[PDB]
Amino acid sequence: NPAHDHFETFVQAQLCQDVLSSFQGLCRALGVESGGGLSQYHKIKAQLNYWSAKSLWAKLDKRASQPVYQQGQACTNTKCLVVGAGPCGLRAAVELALLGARVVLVEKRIKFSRHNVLHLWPFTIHDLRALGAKKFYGRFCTGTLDHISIRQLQLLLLKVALLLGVEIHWGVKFTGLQPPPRKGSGWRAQLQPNPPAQLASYEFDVLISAAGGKFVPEGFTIREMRGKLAIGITANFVNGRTVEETQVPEISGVARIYNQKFFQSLLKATGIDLENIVYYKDETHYFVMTAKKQCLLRLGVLRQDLSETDQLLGKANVVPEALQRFARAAADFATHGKLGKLEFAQDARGRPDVAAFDFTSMMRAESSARVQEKHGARLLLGLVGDCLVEPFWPLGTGVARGFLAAFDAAWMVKRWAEGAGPLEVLAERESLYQLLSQTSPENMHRNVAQYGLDPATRYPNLNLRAVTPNQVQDLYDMMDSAGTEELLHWCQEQTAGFPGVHVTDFSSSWADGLALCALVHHLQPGLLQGMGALEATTWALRVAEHELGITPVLSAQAVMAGSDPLGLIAYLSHFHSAFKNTS
Ligand SMILES: Cc1cc2nc3c(=O)[nH]c(=O)nc-3n(C[C@H](O)[C@H](O)[C@H](O)COP(=O)(O)OP(=O)(O)OC[C@H]3O[C@@H](n4cnc5c(N)ncnc54)[C@H](O)[C@@H]3O)c2cc1C
Ligand SMILES: [Cl-]
């Protein structure tokens, strides 16, 4: 039987190319075209009615039938480009596809090559337990196992995303946005190496960027923040799965709070000074440690004391042989030798798998979402995963906060598909974003099994109006109400003839306060240089109030920052209302 011979190969595939190989071999044996969407998910399960595999269809159909998605129609008029086939990219891709949306994902690499091990919060375990991971990965969180290697997380999620009919492409980097030439024309992706001509023509109205710690799309800004110099070191050793190795208790890291006698012993015993060390028993014996610069220099792990941290941990300044020595001795002391002699696993390049990372930064994007609109054509952009907020690896928030963000973005595209105003969608979304960087299992909802896209199911005492529509206008970039153009033409008419006033808009035009003075001076002749925009703005607001009867809608600061156009429009409307030509 050809059918689910393929399907068993597909399920147990450990290599990206083979998952891909298998699926399109399963598809051919079924008359199903790969790239989906749900319609092709349907014909797959409806033509493969074999035991052991039904367990999986039950799990997926269980999630697929829960009200939020309705029945894959919530987002049928929604077309997405998802960037990044990382875990958060795939996890979000699955939600979009379950929502019924057309999901096309682009990934720059062609293999899952990372072997570092991620901590999984209890809810993510449930979440992907119920996506059928146990079947795609036998060792998935067996017993009290709390973690999963990056590439295994990807092998799972890929298989789920493929099944659900996500059109995925490999070996193609999203470079930027190629905007609409004209109404009716949509947004497209700039891709490279320049894609096939149908991907090239693919027009979308939602972009979800899950591209990892170093790539955010245009217009998204990054708030950088740096703590004390902090050097992270990960390492993977061959885990032979002998009974002896299997008994070595793993090290959680929370012991740095409860146990510092250890770090003293480590230091005395090896000359190694760590701030923390973590050990997970996974496909490899995984260690991540945090080290003091002084310590790494003294041990010849780093060649020279370099001030620019990116050059401090550049290839030229990291001594491979000494780093290996360093990691080996630390791993060995911490597990008291019970792992036997440690042999480095290979990384994907084929090197002893040990690397140093900058752990100093606390990056967050300023917002989780924005909306661009040109020639009436709207594009919702949503951040997910490491690119949104950077995880502190020793504390294991990466998967969980990436997943929370992926649910919040799918929830966002649901509002977007309901027809909500861009400001409303953004405000709601930024209200959720606010909570992300302080989430813990402890301050979240207790019942992880009842978790769904609805943020209420996840965040206790949820305030969906923490950020208001007025506070996210700079997130809505309208670079393309007919009463606004009346107001504008009228405002321009009033302030005409003033040296260095040129009313052009309802933000930057009015920022230095001279526009306001002109308006007032014009409206009441005979009242009253180089004081700042602050004094100009202020006089105008006081004089408007007392002479013209119009109280301030915006503060002076808000006039100068120009980030509240709607409120300036409402201010100005009072002047026009008060002094319209006639009735
Ligand atoms: C080398 C490396 C080692 C790590 N080690 C640990 C660890 O030890 N412990 C821990 O807790 N976390 C670790 N992390 C972070 C962890 O991998 C992520 O939190 C987790 O995978 C979820 O992140 P993500 O999907 O948002 O981003 P990522 O995992 O970075 O995935 C981003 C995806 O986007 C692809 N991509 C990037 N740019 C583009 C582009 N322009 N166009 C198209 N595709 C693009 C990338 O190839 C990648 O596949 C590591 C990350 C990296 C990159
Ligand atoms: Cl692979």
Numbering used by the authors: 8 to 487, 507 to 554, 560 to 614
What does the paper say about this structure?
Three MICAL isoforms (MICAL-1, -2, and -3) have been identified in vertebrates. RP/EBs5 as well as MICALs contain a single type-2 CH domain. F-actin, leading to destabilization and disruption of actin filaments. the oxidation of Met 44 of actin by MICAL.
of the structure of a MICAL fragment containing the entire MO and CH domains. 0.25 and 0.30 using data to 2.31 Å resolution. one single chain monomer per asymmetric unit. used for crystallization MICALMO-CH is a monomer in solution. domain and residues 506–554 and 562–614 of the CH domain. the 19-residue linker that connects the MO and CH domains. is compatible with a flexible linker between the two domains. greater for MICALMO-CH than that for the isolated MO domain. MICALMO-CH, is found in the kinetics of oxidation of actin. significantly increase the efficiency of actin modification by MICAL.
